[PDB]
Design a protein around this ligand. Sequence first.
Ligand code: NAD
Ligand code: NAD
Lengths: 329, 329
Amino acid sequence: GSKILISGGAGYIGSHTLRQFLKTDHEICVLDNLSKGSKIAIEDLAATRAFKFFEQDLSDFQGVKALFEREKFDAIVHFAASIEVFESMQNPLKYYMNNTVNTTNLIETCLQTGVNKFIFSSTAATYGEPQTPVVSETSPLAPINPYGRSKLMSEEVLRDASMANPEFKHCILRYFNVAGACMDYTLGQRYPKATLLIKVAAECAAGKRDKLFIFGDDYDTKDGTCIRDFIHVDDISSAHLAALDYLKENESNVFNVGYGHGFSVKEVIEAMKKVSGVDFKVELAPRRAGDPSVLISDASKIRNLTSWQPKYDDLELICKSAFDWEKQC
Amino acid sequence: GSKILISGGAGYIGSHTLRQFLKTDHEICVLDNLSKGSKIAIEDLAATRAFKFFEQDLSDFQGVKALFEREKFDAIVHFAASIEVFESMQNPLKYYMNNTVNTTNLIETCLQTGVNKFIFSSTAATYGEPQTPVVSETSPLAPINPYGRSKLMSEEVLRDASMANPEFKHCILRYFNVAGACMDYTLGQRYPKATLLIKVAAECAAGKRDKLFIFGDDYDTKDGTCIRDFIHVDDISSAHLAALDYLKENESNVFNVGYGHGFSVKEVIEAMKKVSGVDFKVELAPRRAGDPSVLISDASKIRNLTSWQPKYDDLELICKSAFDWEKQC
Ligand SMILES: NC(=O)c1ccc[n+]([C@@H]2O[C@H](COP(=O)([O-])OP(=O)(O)OC[C@H]3O[C@@H](n4cnc5c(N)ncnc54)[C@H](O)[C@@H]3O)[C@@H](O)[C@H]2O)c1
Ligand SMILES: NC(=O)c1ccc[n+]([C@@H]2O[C@H](COP(=O)([O-])OP(=O)(O)OC[C@H]3O[C@@H](n4cnc5c(N)ncnc54)[C@H](O)[C@@H]3O)[C@@H](O)[C@H]2O)c1
């Protein structure tokens, strides 16, 4: 099958996507500098099928160009990035360098070496603070932090690349938080945004965080608590495969990836407690001014245009996954 | 005196800005890879007063860093860029690499080595196709070509840099076309927009283009032809000195640089013919689709907030400068 490069393939979503790709007939290559990635995940999957692992940094532009000249990829699935909003506020240049700059060279290199299918892991952070509860791909791109801006800039480079080079196809995926992701800057936030609800719930259940606060229980929602968008690592993983499949006969596009509905704070707490067996401390607090009652992706486009079908839209499974991965963080 | 680095100092505006800086008490350095800039103009100024010249390419990040770690600049005036809208349309990655990417490393390097004053040469192209005849610093930033996007991206990195690093001050200058600028790639463009009219007129007078079109003479303007914004190379150069001065006692800012009025197509044509003594072919055509009657900078902010004062707001002197430099391109 086709030759695919997965950048960031040693990381959380990349390695899960790697595992799924290995069950296909594609020829698989992986690039990762192992900055956050783990070699052991890689070795463990090499004892499944063979794939080339390139321990290379995307900031070495010549090394990237040469890898691409030698290997002649048909596609790249690009996960490599720095991913923490809080860190980006403190250290914006790290985000513009590791995300926007490295991605820009990567795109130029794709163009020079005939890599004409590019799947880009973008983010819902590109929407900033959306003015609707269910965000569609057409909502304004108005990021409010350097992480969000750094990703939007790469989206815009991809768009210009495709317009100048009709043969070059990109598919951009945006999504909210993925359960089980290890973030170094979350535990130090006492009152994180509700978009990090599963991470916080997992941190409490693992005895890492002392209390979980519910900010407001009188919203116009099912149970009065906030509704947010979370996704299983294997479901966001499969959507990247679906995105590549989509680029076979279809033109460039951008898709939200999500279940098309959210989960409430109350639901996540109940599920996390049940699945972990830990009755961690939760306290009711007043509404936090500015917090929308509902913020989720509109996933109708991806359902409509691709073969993507999630199979872990199950809060207990998602919380279990987050819990298990949390203890590894 | 303060130690100042002028990136792109061998180029058109950079060399005229360098000449003005050499009159001050500042320790001046110039960085340029001579990809377009002339070492000739450099040597013939390095006679007048002594300045350090570094033939260094901004794409070499480690070399830029070594240089900055050694020299410990107090300020940078950053002109180095690729500058052709028409070329950016055909080769967007050249523009994202040479502009956004190189500038991003430059900014990180400034932060790492204490360069806490950054004057950036941006562009009216950040405004895109404005809804108003006159554009102020608060007009929406909606560039419509990769050149304009590449510059806007860098303005955004600067904004984030100063937010996370209060000691780091930036001043951004936006302006329309500078009379006399070489734009070799666009000579291959049949119908440049009216914003490039003075250049097209110069090219006709120099015999490099056979013909010049006037698209519409029935607009609601003094003489019925389009009105656009042009500036003398020495006036935009002084604005850059003013910007650095402004930063001594003030926080980061952005200014338009302009005369506060425009010049009509007809006036530019007649002045170009007068100055050059060449009665080149002018052909009158219908209105061109998308053409606003008027498009100029509101420059009231910079007048009010800085010491900047135009010295050569004279259509004849501007066309003479354009014609003289045209033959040098
Ligand atoms: N909740 C989420 O985790 C989430 C949500 C939305 C979007 N995303 C996006 O999905 C992608 C992956 O997310 P993740 O959770 O797997 O993060 P991750 O940190 O686990 O994966 C990133 C991988 O890329 C590698 N990498 C980073 N910089 C590199 C460089 N300069 N050169 C070579 N390799 C490099 C890291 O070592 C790592 O293995 C990112 O693009 C991120 O922005 C993630
Ligand atoms: N000329 C105009 O009409 C106009 C209008 C608005 C804004 N500007 C801006 O002013 C600045 C300078 O304009 P200009 O007309 O003098 O252009 P220029 O081409 O004459 O000068 C640019 C200089 O930067 C140098 N340079 C380019 N890339 C480099 C790199 N990677 N490393 C080291 N040096 C490099 C070139 O060699 C050159 O001497 C640019 O940033 C441009 O965007 C120009």
